């Protein structure tokens, strides 16, 4: 299998090959998000590509429907890296389609 670091590397390669250099990182408190964010930041910093990582949204709050809407509206990129559980992914994608 592949660790989360290798999946992040493949995702960054995907973003690079299609010239999506502007992106936002949206994660929950789901386990492993600390290592995911750390690896993403380390790869971005030690890179000559010129990544534009903005709006690191650690949603954290369990869909209180009060802060999450503004948190998602704070994103103005075109590529969003989402790290959360499948049910949390369903909730967040439904909220995004609402927004």
């Amino acid at each position: 299998g592949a660790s989360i670091q290798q999946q992040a590397t493949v995702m960054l390669k995907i973003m690079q090959d299609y010239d999506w250099h502007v992106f936002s990182l949206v994660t929950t408190i789901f386990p492993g998000y600390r290592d995911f964010i750390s690896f993403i930041k380390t790869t971005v910093d030690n890179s000559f590509v010129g990544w534009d990582m903005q709006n690191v949204i650690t949603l954290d709050t369990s869909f209180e429907d009060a802060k999450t809407q503004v948190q998602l509206k704070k994103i103005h990129s075109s590529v969003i890296l989402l790290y959360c559980s499948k049910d949390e992914a369903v909730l967040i994608l439904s909220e995004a389609r609402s927004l």
Binding site: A66, Q69, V70, K73
Partner: protein, 437 residues
């Protein structure tokens, strides 16, 4: 030969005998020729009483004009006064209360005039404030109060006619108002992302909206509220659930007593009559009566109506637009300070806005100020190639687009009270460009 001017009072603590011995032989040596005031007060403001008293008053003394005062609460009184003025061709002036709120369309034969301002002028002043503090981002919140479409039209006209390309965010509407479900409107209020909000609603709707915003966390720093006179209500008694820092724009009447306003209105009528006497040898004809049917308008009435549109009293411009409201008044931007009192903040001269605070105080809780960490105070000095200081354009009062505003201090002149006009200037140059970058 004395111009019979009748002063009618509303129900704002009905008393006129205490204020009766101050106009019979007064305000005639000031400037007018000869006046004769007839004072009658109504303790109830229902349409039957208004019609009965005004018709009985017009049935005697050969009245020339009528001066009306209301409380603030009622709004149909303006329409009733318009109806009476159209039916009897007697000039009626509205002084204060809800009757002074401007009716944009009026009956063609009506001579009803209001010492008030349309929504367009208030929006002009509010957008001037926004430009002064560079609040280019704002959101419009309205209720289903009648005239919301007019408010939105005025906002659109002001934004298009300006030169700043304002960013108008999503427009919100309050549906239920007093019977708010606190669920749908709450969801909409929590879906906002604007630092400046312009609200249209009545007094009760204003209280409901502000209480719901306090529930939704739209109060305190980082959020500014601008409202017209409709939500203001009584200025002397600001109610609870009114956020500190609420901004409104009212004419120069909010700190004027009733006697001053009444004498001002009688002075306007007398000045119009004096101008008519100057041009036409005879005095303007008095109103006939409520009965009969004065179908058309005689040229005598029309000349009188056109001769009191342009009246200047004590240096104050009381010109009336064809829609029967003040066209070029001196406005005042008032705000609610930490002591829960409506405090004078800015003036609106001929075409210029004079503010008092260079930085808007963002009180967080009760009285406690904030610092706005992302805000800097910069001290400069005039050096010809680096910092050039000039004066703003007198016609507009603003700075040249390539410059930035800048004030100056002074020795002595204790400025804690902030009752000191700016020596406002504009700065440009190498250092200013570096600072902008």
């Amino acid at each position: 030969q004395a111009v019979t001017v009748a002063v009618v009072f509303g129900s704002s603590g009905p008393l006129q005998t205490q204020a009766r011995t101050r106009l019979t032989s007064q305000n005639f040596l000031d400037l007018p020729l000869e006046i004769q005031p007839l004072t009658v007060g109504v303790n109830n403001t229902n349409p039957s009483s208004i019609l009965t008293q005004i018709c009985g008053l017009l049935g005697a003394a050969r009245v020339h004009g009528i001066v009306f005062e209301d409380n603030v609460d009622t709004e149909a009184v303006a329409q009733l006064l318009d109806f009476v003025s159209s039916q009897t061709h007697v000039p009626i002036l509205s002084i204060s209360g809800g009757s002074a709120v401007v009716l944009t369309p009026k009956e063609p034969g009506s001579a009803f005039l209001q010492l008030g301002v349309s929504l367009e002028q208030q929006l002009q002043v509010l957008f001037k404030v926004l430009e002064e503090y560079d609040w280019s981002a704002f959101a419009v919140i309205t209720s289903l109060h009648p005239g919301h479409a007019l408010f939105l039209e005025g906002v659109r006209a002001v934004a298009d006619a300006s030169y700043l390309s304002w960013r108008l965010l999503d427009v919100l509407t309050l549906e239920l108002g007093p019977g708010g479900p606190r669920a749908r409107t709450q969801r909409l209020l929590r879906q906002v992302d604007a630092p400046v909000l312009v609200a249209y609603c009545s007094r009760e709707e204003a209280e409901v909206l502000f209480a719901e915003a306090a529930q939704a966390g739209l109060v305190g720093p980082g959020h500014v509220w601008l409202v017209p006179n409709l939500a203001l209500g009584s200025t002397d008694a600001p109610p609870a659930a009114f956020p500190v820092g609420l901004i409104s724009v009212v004419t120069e009447s909010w700190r004027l007593s009733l006697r001053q306003k009444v004498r001002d209105g009688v002075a306007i009528l007398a000045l119009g009559a004096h101008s008519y006497r100057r041009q036409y040898g005879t005095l303007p004809a008095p109103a006939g009566d409520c009965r009969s049917h004065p179908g058309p308008v005689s040229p005598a009435r029309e000349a009188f109506y056109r001769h009191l549109l342009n009246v200047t009293w004590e240096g104050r411009d009381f010109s009336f637009s064809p829609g029967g409201y003040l066209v070029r008044p001196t406005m005042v931007v008032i705000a609610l300070n930490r002591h829960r009192l409506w405090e004078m903040v800015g003036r609106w001269d001929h075409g210029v806005l004079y503010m008092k605070y260079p930085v808007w105080p963002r009180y967080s809780t009760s009285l406690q100020p904030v610092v706005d960490s992302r805000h800097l105070t910069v001290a400069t000095l005039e050096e010809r190639p680096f910092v050039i200081v000039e004066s703003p354009d007198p016609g507009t009062g603003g700075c040249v687009p390539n410059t930035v505003p800048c004030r100056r201090q002074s020795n002595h002149t204790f400025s804690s009270g902030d009752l000191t006009p700016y020596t406002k200037l504009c700065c440009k140059g190498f250092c200013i460009d570096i600072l902008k970058k």
